[PDB]
Design a protein around this motif. Structure first.
Motif, PDB file in Angstrom:
ATOM      1  N   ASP A  32      -1.022  -3.217  -6.100  1.00 40.68           N
ATOM      2  CA  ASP A  32      -2.177  -2.537  -5.548  1.00 40.68           C
ATOM      3  C   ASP A  32      -3.217  -3.582  -5.177  1.00 40.68           C
ATOM      4  N   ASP A  70      -6.636   4.301 -10.032  1.00 42.58           N
ATOM      5  CA  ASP A  70      -5.733   5.386 -10.413  1.00 42.58           C
ATOM      6  C   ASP A  70      -6.143   5.854 -11.801  1.00 42.58           C
ATOM      7  N   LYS A 103      -6.425  -2.386  -3.838  1.00 40.37           N
ATOM      8  CA  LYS A 103      -7.669  -1.736  -4.230  1.00 40.37           C
ATOM      9  C   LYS A 103      -7.374  -0.944  -5.489  1.00 40.37           C
ATOM     10  N   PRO A 104      -7.696  -1.479  -6.657  1.00 51.07           N
ATOM     11  CA  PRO A 104      -7.186  -0.926  -7.918  1.00 51.07           C
ATOM     12  C   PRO A 104      -7.948   0.319  -8.339  1.00 51.07           C
ATOM     13  N   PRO A 159      -0.971   0.909 -11.844  1.00 49.20           N
ATOM     14  CA  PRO A 159      -0.671   0.788 -10.405  1.00 49.20           C
ATOM     15  C   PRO A 159       0.258  -0.381 -10.088  1.00 49.20           C
ATOM     16  N   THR A 160       1.351  -0.479 -10.839  1.00 50.36           N
ATOM     17  CA  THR A 160       2.344  -1.532 -10.671  1.00 50.36           C
ATOM     18  C   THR A 160       3.686  -0.863 -10.439  1.00 50.36           C
ATOM     19  N   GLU A 161       4.334  -1.182  -9.328  1.00 52.69           N
ATOM     20  CA  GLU A 161       5.551  -0.495  -8.937  1.00 52.69           C
ATOM     21  C   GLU A 161       6.677  -1.498  -8.730  1.00 52.69           C
ATOM     22  N   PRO A 184       0.843  -1.198   0.000  1.00 60.21           N
ATOM     23  CA  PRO A 184       0.000   0.000   0.000  1.00 60.21           C
ATOM     24  C   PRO A 184       0.874   1.243   0.000  1.00 60.21           C
ATOM     25  N   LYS A 185       1.698   1.436   1.038  1.00 64.11           N
ATOM     26  CA  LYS A 185       2.367   2.713   1.269  1.00 64.11           C
ATOM     27  C   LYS A 185       3.802   2.546   1.762  1.00 64.11           C
TER      28      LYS A 185
END
Lengths: 279, 286, 94, 99, 48
Positions: free
Chosen positions: B121, B126, B123-124, B130-132, B95-96
């Motif tokens: 992620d 953006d 909860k998708p 959302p892939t880091e 998450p963070k």
């Protein structure tokens, strides 16, 4: 057979030099420039093959075929321990990089001679390549007063006597060194100088406006330096084409650099927040 | 060093189902696991993964455990079933950026050299992707700590594959904005693109939150790029931009004019091919 | 200090602001372009130079005010130009 | 003689190259030739269009300028027009006669 | 004078001397008139 036949066949090329015959000399040397992988006992013999190859490249204009020649008489494992006869090997390894014509082979050849521990023992010749490495050179008369005298001095006087002694090949080295110092102006003049007057450039070459036009002419008809000179207002300029497409084209280039640039900070900010405002 | 990463939909769901299967814990659990795959031609690949048993207490949140026996047996089963497949790094549910995710990489770096992590992620939502993925870099440098190490984000995207696209497009069955013509780019990047620029304008505004009030370190390594942006803002309208711009627009509209010039005549020819299908059919049939 | 409107100084202005003569400012700025702190072209006959890139410096909490303000109305140009795209490009794709 | 024409013009393109304008009195000096036959010969260059530019009668300034113009874009779209006009002429032969 | 006033011709009269000078106005292409000469016909040709 590896040695004796080679010793036989490299003899008669100096006999062809006694004929003053280079067109035979290079053909009979073409037999032996492919003769290698024998660097085990041949100490002086390959060095004789090179010293009969000083002149075949030295005669007409070949000041860049002597590159691998002169580093090849830096190559031989005996020379490293005869320091003063090795000092004239530091001479012949620098008296062509100036003298070779302008090339990418010269422009990385300065790096092939650069970065040496035992060549920079001569305090002058690190500075000589430093001059043609770096920015604007001090004309010619402000140079020859600083370096046209050390050629007689040091433990290194002999290929500098191959520059001095012959007044004709030597004069070709006065005018080829003079070519490199009068050209070294013209390179960065074309680089940074948008529009300069003719008299200012003839003054920074310390010679006539007419001979200045002879210098700019044979290089723009060589088209290695593009210039649009004037003989009514003396207003010459470098690299001034019409440019229909490169305006918006390089502007689009500025767009792509810009979008990369604004993309650069965005993924960099979030970790900078998370190192002081994580927990 | 590492150009970019390749993420598959199989690993993409293969994290989320595990978040479902530990979703019964209710309170708090991050999905951390082992990331498998290759990296070839300086391109990172992610093909397989699994998740490790992990627990964490909020008091003393510097303690992590990976059952490395479970790491050995199951990856031995995975090398066994697939010798081509190997380790590529790890992942956490991200998450963070939780705080044990500085040494989880240093814990298991003895397996992969570039032991990469992946934030996913749960909860998708953006306006992007959302892939880091980060990467480990360390520094004996500047001024933070004499022992300093901070992750840096490598660019991340979802790698496709001919095998998996049958399952992807098979399991979509919902909507797909194909018919790539004059309006595919309009919506994937000209509608979506300017709103792409919206959030990138918003993130520097989120950094601008420290003018006198935010965190205590000020700039150092932020402002060279900031000065570079406004330094490199593009050229104003005084020269040939409007000229050569009008020139090249004035040349492109020629081609547009020719294309519209043909198209009408084509459809007219088609209507004549219809009136032959009318006039010599009305008398013939009736 | 000069904005991106002009940023075109002259050798008389270097000869004023640095009180160094006419025949040495060009050797100064050729050295400056060789070092690479500044990036601009040199005209000799109009005695002006077209400096483009400056070496980035550091700044206090006052320059972030001006950079904030030049950012702020630059947001709404994106809002404004995007608004025609959403309005006119509405029926091309709902 | 004919080789001397091509050698004359080989020098004549050689020295004229590096500039935009000059007076005829310098190029007469620099090829070491007269001004009348050089003026007529330069006129023949810009009559035969092998060299292009302009000349002056007041003092003889030769204004040299060159750009390759855009040619492919307009005419190749222009002959498609006269194709399609004939196509519409054929549309009489299946349209006007038929319905 | 009214040929200047109403549009038509632009450049000046040396009313003291008597010659009416006229400037050479070329490159009307990058002047964005023929884009309008297009766009009148782009839209209409799409319409037909």
């Amino acid at each position: 057979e590896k040695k004796e036949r080679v010793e036989f066949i490299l003899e008669q090329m100096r006999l062809c030099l006694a004929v003053k015959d280079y067109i035979r000399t290079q053909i009979i040397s073409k037999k032996i420039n492919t003769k290698f992988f024998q660097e085990e006992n041949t100490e002086k013999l390959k060095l004789k093959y090179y010293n009969l190859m000083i002149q075949l490249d030295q005669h007409e204009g070949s000041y860049l075929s002597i590159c691998k020649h002169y580093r090849a008489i830096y190559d031989t494992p005996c020379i490293q321990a005869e320091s003063e006869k090795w000092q004239q090997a530091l001479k012949s390894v620098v008296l062509y990089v100036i003298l070779a014509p302008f090339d990418n082979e010269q422009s990385d050849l300065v790096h092939r001679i650069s970065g040496d521990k035992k060549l920079e023992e001569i305090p002058k010749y690190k500075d000589l390549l430093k001059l043609f490495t770096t920015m604007e050179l001090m004309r010619w008369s402000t140079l020859v007063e600083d370096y046209g005298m050390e050629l007689r001095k040091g433990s290194l006087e002999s290929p500098a006597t191959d520059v001095f002694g012959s007044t004709e090949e030597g004069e070709k080295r006065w005018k080829d060194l003079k070519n490199r110092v009068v050209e070294h102006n013209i390179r960065i003049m074309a680089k940074y100088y948008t529009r300069i007057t003719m008299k200012r450039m003839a003054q920074l070459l310390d010679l006539s406006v007419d001979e200045s036009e002879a210098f700019l002419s044979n290089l723009v008809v060589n088209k290695t330096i593009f210039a649009k000179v004037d003989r009514l207002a003396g207003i010459i300029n470098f690299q001034r084409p019409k440019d229909p497409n490169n305006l918006l084209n390089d502007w689009s280039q500025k767009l792509n650099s810009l979008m990369s640039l604004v993309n650069k900070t965005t993924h960099l900010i979030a970790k900078e927040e998370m190192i002081h405002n994580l927990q | 060093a590492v150009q970019k990463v390749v993420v598959h939909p199989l690993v993409l769901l293969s994290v989320v189902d595990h978040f479902n299967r530990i979703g019964k814990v209710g309170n708090q659990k991050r999905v951390v696991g082992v990331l498998l795959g290759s990296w070839q031609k300086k391109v990172l690949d992610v093909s397989n993964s699994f998740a490790v048993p992990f627990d964490e207490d909020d008091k003393d949140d510097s303690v992590w455990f990976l059952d490395h026996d479970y790491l050995e047996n199951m990856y031995g089963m995975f090398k066994k079933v697939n010798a081509r497949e190997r380790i590529v790094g790890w992942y956490h549910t991200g998450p963070k950026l939780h705080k044990n995710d500085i040494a989880i990489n240093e814990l298991m770096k003895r397996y992969c050299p570039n032991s990469v992590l992946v934030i996913i992620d749960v909860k998708p939502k953006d306006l992007g992707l959302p892939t880091e993925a980060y990467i480990s870099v360390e520094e004996v440098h500047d001024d933070g700590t004499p022992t300093s190490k901070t992750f840096e984000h490598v660019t991340s995207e979802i790698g496709a594959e001919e095998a998996e696209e049958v399952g992807v497009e098979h399991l979509l069955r919902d909507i797909k904005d194909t018919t790539v013509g004059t309006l595919s780019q309009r919506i994937t990047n000209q509608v979506h693109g300017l709103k792409g620029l919206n959030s990138k304008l918003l993130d520097i505004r989120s950094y601008l939150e420290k003018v006198a009030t935010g965190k205590l370190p000020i700039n150092h390594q932020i402002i060279y790029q900031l000065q570079d942006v406004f330094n490199l803002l593009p050229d104003v309208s005084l020269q040939e931009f409007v000229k050569a711009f009008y020139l090249k627009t004035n040349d492109q509209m020629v081609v547009v004019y020719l294309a519209s010039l043909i198209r009408s005549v084509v459809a007219l020819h088609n209507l004549i091919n219809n009136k032959i299908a009318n006039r010599d059919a009305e008398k013939k049939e009736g | 200090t000069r904005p991106a409107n002009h940023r075109q100084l002259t050798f008389e202005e270097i000869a004023k602001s640095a009180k160094i003569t006419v025949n040495e400012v060009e050797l100064l700025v050729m050295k400056a372009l060789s070092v690479g702190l500044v990036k601009g072209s040199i005209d000799e006959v109009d005695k002006r130079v077209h400096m483009t890139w400056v070496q980035p410096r550091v700044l206090d909490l006052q320059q972030i005010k001006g950079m904030k303000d030049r950012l702020e109305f630059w947001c709404t140009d994106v809002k404004s130009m995007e608004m025609l795209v959403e309005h006119q490009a509405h029926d091309i794709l709902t | 003689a004919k080789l001397y024409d091509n050698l004359l013009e080989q020098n004549l393109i050689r020295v004229i190259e590096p500039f935009s304008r000059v007076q005829i009195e310098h190029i007469s000096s620099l090829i070491k030739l007269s001004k009348a036959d050089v003026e007529r010969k330069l006129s023949q260059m810009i009559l035969d269009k092998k060299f292009h530019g302009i000349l002056d009668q007041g003092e003889g300034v030769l204004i040299i300028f060159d750009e390759p113009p855009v040619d492919k874009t307009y005419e190749a779209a222009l002959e498609t027009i006269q194709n399609m006009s004939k196509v519409v002429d054929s549309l009489y032969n299946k349209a006007k006669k038929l319905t | 004078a009214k040929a200047i006033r109403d549009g038509v011709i632009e450049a000046s009269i040396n009313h003291e001397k008597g010659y009416v000078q006229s400037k050479e106005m070329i490159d009307i292409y990058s002047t964005r008139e023929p884009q309008l000469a297009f766009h009148q016909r782009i839209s209409f040709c799409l319409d037909i």
